């Protein structure tokens, strides 16, 4: 899998986290 | 806006994320 | 302290975050 | 949205920047 | 000086670049 | 192209690498 | 090729960018 | 798990890769 | 706190370092 | 020595790793 | 060995650098 | 100019810093 660096929609500040896809 | 790499306050968690400002 | 990159235990969508250790 | 680290197309410049998607 | 990672307003794609301040 | 961070399929020790996509 | 981080000659606001060398 | 950035001893160039631990 | 990248005042060889702000 | 972030030549793999020089 | 991104102790300086371990 | 990420020889720990060249 790969890590996407995306805003967390489950965060009221749209913090950019790593998403493991 | 800017993206800064910061520890998210308010917790013990120690998470460092991209904050959009 | 150092910046670690770890899976966020508890997160429900396989998140990877910086961590201040 | 996500931020990817990509070479900006269309040029010779070779610039790599954060693209917001 | 420091490098801020910010959207370029002189870019029609808001590409995130390093700004030297 | 963009820099992706993905697991290295085939690698025997769970390696994560940049990938030029 | 390698990712270099260099000042963008020509840019009018002291920009620093990745560069594919 | 976390990603350690370490030389690969299974590489004759000691390339630094992400190790998933 | 956030990771800034700044010139190291005092350093005699134009060093750029992370800075915990 | 320096660490550069480069695509490892010789292959199709597209791996980008830290090279020590 | 590994490279970690850590604040260098012993000072007020707040410098974050790559430590080789 | 560009930033090289190199061990500081004026450091007894060979810490990797950004060198402005």
Numbering used by the authors:
A (entry chain C), B (entry chain A), C (entry chain B), D (entry chain A), E (entry chain C), F (entry chain B), ...: 1 to 21
Article passage:
In Alzheimer’s disease, the Aβ peptide self-assembles to form oligomers and fibrils. β-Hairpins have emerged as important structural motifs adopted by the Aβ peptide in both the oligomeric and fibrillar state.75−78 β-Hairpins are the simplest type of β-sheet, comprising two antiparallel hydrogen-bonded β-strands connected by a loop. Using this approach, we have discovered that β-hairpin peptides that mimic Aβ17–36 β-hairpins assemble to form triangular trimers that further assemble to form higher-order oligomers, such as hexamers and dodecamers. In this paper, we use the approach above to study the Aβ oligomer model 2AT-L, a covalently stabilized triangular trimer composed of Aβ17–36 β-hairpin peptides.
We designed 2AT-L as a covalently stabilized analogue of a triangular trimer formed by 2AM-L. The design of 2AT-L is based on the previously reported X-ray crystallographic structures of triangular trimers composed of β-hairpin peptides derived from Aβ17–36.88−90 At the three corners of these triangular trimers, Leu17 of one monomer subunit is near Ala21 of an adjacent monomer subunit. To stabilize 2AM-L into a triangular trimer, we mutated Leu17 and Ala21 to cysteine to create 2AM-LCC. The X-ray crystallographic structure reveals that 2AT-L is composed of three folded β-hairpins that are cross-linked together in the envisioned manner, in which Cys17 on one monomer forms a disulfide bond with Cys21 of the adjacent monomer at each corner. The Aβ17–23 and Aβ30–36 β-strands of the three β-hairpins that comprise 2AT-L consist mainly of residues from the hydrophobic central and C-terminal regions of Aβ, creating two hydrophobic surfaces on 2AT-L. The three hydrophilic Aβ24–29 loops extend off the hydrophobic core of 2AT-L. In the crystal lattice, four copies of 2AT-L assemble to form a ball-shaped dodecamer. The dodecamer is stabilized by an edge-to-edge hydrogen-bonding network between the backbones of adjacent trimers and by hydrophobic packing at the core of the dodecamer between the surfaces of the trimers that contain Val18, Phe20, and Ile31. The outer surface of the dodecamer displays the hydrophobic amino acids on the other surface of the trimer—Phe19, Ile32, Leu34, and Val36, as well as the disulfide bond between Cys17 and Cys21. In the crystal lattice, six dodecamers pack together to form an annular pore-like structure.
